């Protein structure tokens, strides 16, 4: 179930090999949408499955009249969502600037329904999205373990971990605001928070193990563009009070240049400056010597990411580890011919005689909860929590 | 081909040791058991006798004609194994 260069590995050798990669000069993680189903997320298949059932009348119009989506993928549930949203936004903008009243009202309903469907699944908690201290719940038990394991394994004088993700939910921020760790995500300020691309070059020092970096490749729920041509960030409560309540409990969609998720409104020269910078920073990271990368929860359905990853293996000091649950079905389907682009890409990647590539298979042995268990603790890390008792006693004093 | 055996090589001629090739030795803790080994070998190496006194269980040191250079070997278990064990005195005294 574990392959490295064509042959097979066992549990002990794999566990020993993983520990050696965590001590390189540069370490990083790339997570997808499959890493949030353990806390309340939904896979891209379920979003389409629900949208198709809920809004049948628009489905025929999308397939027959405007030629935005085909029929085989709709019947197989293999439809990319963000590309469709970008195309719909482009169509709406063209119709608005051409002054065609008939088509202007046709795309508003489609965009509103799509945004209602995608947003309602991104609230990992639900109605308690507004409240504070959402990192103390049991659902986020493993993100803290991941962050602690990544941070505690760095010697003094070395760099800091870098985390890339393709989600637009607030799981990592909630987890990292409970440990006592600060993450740099490019924004600064409180009363007016703006985007400064040079903030990815700073660090803290003590004048008498605090920080990490977080890159989001698809935006976030708390980012929006106001009347001025600038990008702003707000807290969860303010965003809910401002524009998230109306999306879910109203037929409200007025501004097409407002939201910055997911990968939408890219034709504006002010909004694409964020996606381009994030993608450039991702591309530059894996070009450094003595680098490692762990991939989990990502379905290989993007051309540019695959192109960048495959072209980065020319250097003799780049190592990658891939987790893929449904591996045997891919092999069987590729053997008889056919198969999607993801299956072909991952099968071709597996069959090379390279010692720099490792692929892990299995049904439940490749999930996110199992990826965390492989990373090791240090010997001297304090594990027994003996602080909550004192907090309880203080609260009981009253 | 012969096999000369001595765990106390001090009371023996070094020519017995210098005119021979192969040897095997596990952990052995005694300071006066290495004088012949110290003298017999020609000049060129003397620092490799220190670690023979701390080998853990299952490790051995072998060197001779059959090997190009001295090497430290971890010996695998032989299956089927040797005799189980000696007598156990727990059952005899269980009469109490």
């Amino acid at each position: 179930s574990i392959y490295q260069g064509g042959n097979k590995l066992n549990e002990d050798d794999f566990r020993s090999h993983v520990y050696s990669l965590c001590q390189l000069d540069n370490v990083g993680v790339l997570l997808g949408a499959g890493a949030s189903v353990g806390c309340g997320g939904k896979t891209m298949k379920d979003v389409w499955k629900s949208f198709k059932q809920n809004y049948p009348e628009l489905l025929g119009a999308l397939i027959d009249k405007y030629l935005l989506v085909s029929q085989i993928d709709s019947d197989n549930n293999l439809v990319n969502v963000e590309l469709l949203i970008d195309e719909a936004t482009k169509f709406l903008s063209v119709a608005k600037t051409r002054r065609c009243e008939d088509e202007e009202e046709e795309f508003r309903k489609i965009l509103s329904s799509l945004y209602k469907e995608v947003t309602k699944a991104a609230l990992l908690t639900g109605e308690q999205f507004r409240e504070k201290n959402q990192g103390k719940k049991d659902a986020f038990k493993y993100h803290k373990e991941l962050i602690s394991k990544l941070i505690s394994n760095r010697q003094p004088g070395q760099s800091a971990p870098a985390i890339f993700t393709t989600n637009y939910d607030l799981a990592l921020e909630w987890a990292a605001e409970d440990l006592g760790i600060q993450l740099f995500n490019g924004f600064s300020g409180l009363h007016t928070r703006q985007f400064y691309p040079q903030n990815f070059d700073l660090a803290f020092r003590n004048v008498n193990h605090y920080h990490a970096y977080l890159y989001k490749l698809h935006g976030s729920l708390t980012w929006y563009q106001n009347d001025s041509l600038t990008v702003n960030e707000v807290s969860a409560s303010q965003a809910y009070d401002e524009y998230i309540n109306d999306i879910i409990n109203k037929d409200d969609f007025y501004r097409g240049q407002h939201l910055i998720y997911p990968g939408a409104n890219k034709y504006s020269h002010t909004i694409g400056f964020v996606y381009g910078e994030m993608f450039r920073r991702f591309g530059e990271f894996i070009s450094k010597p003595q680098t490692a990368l762990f991939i989990n929860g990502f379905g290989f359905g993007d051309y540019h990411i695959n192109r960048i990853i495959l072209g980065a293996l020319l250097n003799p000091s780049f190592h990658v580890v891939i987790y893929y649950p449904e591996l045997k079905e891919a092999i069987t389907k590729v053997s008889k011919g056919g198969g999607s682009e993801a299956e072909k890409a991952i099968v071709t990647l597996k069959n090379m005689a390279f010692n720099q590539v490792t692929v892990v298979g299995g049904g439940s042995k490749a999930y996110f909860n199992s990826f965390v268990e492989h990373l090791p603790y240090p010997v001297l890390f304090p594990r027994d929590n003996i602080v909550d008792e004192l907090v309880e006693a203080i609260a009981n004093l009253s | 081909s012969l096999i000369v055996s001595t765990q106390r090589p001090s009371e023996l001629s070094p020519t017995v040791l210098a005119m021979c090739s192969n040897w095997f030795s596990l952990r052995l803790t005694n300071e006066r058991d290495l004088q012949a080994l110290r003298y017999a070998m020609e000049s060129g190496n003397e620092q490799i006798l220190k670690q023979i006194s701390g080998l853990p269980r299952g490790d051995a040191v072998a060197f001779g004609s059959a090997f190009n250079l001295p090497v430290r070997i971890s010996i695998n278990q032989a299956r089927p194994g040797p005799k189980s064990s000696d007598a156990v005195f727990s059952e005899e005294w269980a009469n109490c």
Binding site: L21, L24 | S1, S5, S21, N22, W23, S65, N68, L69
Partner: protein
């Protein structure tokens, strides 16, 4: 697109004082590790093996000392042999009268080179007996020749409760399995 070596360097030689080689350490090494096309190797633990490249030979050495002097690090090593390329592969020779030159680069040796040193004739591989694996790395197999064991002298020793009878049985059984007909008392 031209790369002279596929493996990165670590240090360079600055002084020879007989058979004691002095090497200064670079700054690019930070996490006592180095990665290449086959895996990750460590060099910062005294008692391991290193190598020096000089033309058509590779000088194999053994680390003895390590210490500090701007933080500077130095390493002392002794040479034990060299590696040669003859027809299409490699062979190891056992003379240590050859020494490197000043300015030579220092590079760790991978498992491919380690296999050659603790190896014997390929023709004897069907005629060999397996004993165990390497102790320091546990990545190399060890084989012995039965014919040469009974040509020169051999001896066995050992303490109590450490595996003397285990080795005796393991060695005796394989000879019978390979050569059922022999004269041994």
């Amino acid at each position: 697109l031209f790369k002279l070596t596929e493996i990165s360097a670590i240090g360079y030689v600055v002084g020879l004082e007989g058979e004691r080689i002095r090497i200064n350490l670079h700054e690019g090494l930070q996490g006592r590790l180095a990665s290449h096309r086959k895996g990750v190797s460590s060099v910062t633990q005294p008692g391991d093996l290193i190598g020096f490249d000089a033309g058509n030979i590779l000088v194999v050495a053994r680390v003895t000392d390590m210490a500090f002097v701007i933080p500077l690090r130095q390493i002392i090593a002794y040479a034990i042999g060299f590696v040669k390329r003859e027809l299409n592969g490699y062979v190891f020779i056992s003379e240590d009268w050859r020494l490197p030159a000043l300015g030579s680069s220092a590079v760790p040796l991978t498992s491919d080179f380690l296999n050659i040193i603790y190896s014997i004739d390929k023709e004897e591989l069907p005629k060999a007996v397996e004993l165990g694996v390497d102790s320091r790395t546990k990545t190399v197999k060890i084989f012995a020749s039965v014919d040469k064991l009974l040509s020169r002298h051999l001896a066995v020793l050992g303490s109590t409760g450490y595996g003397k009878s285990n080795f005796n049985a393991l060695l005796t059984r394989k000879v019978s399995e390979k050569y059922p007909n022999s004269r041994i008392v």
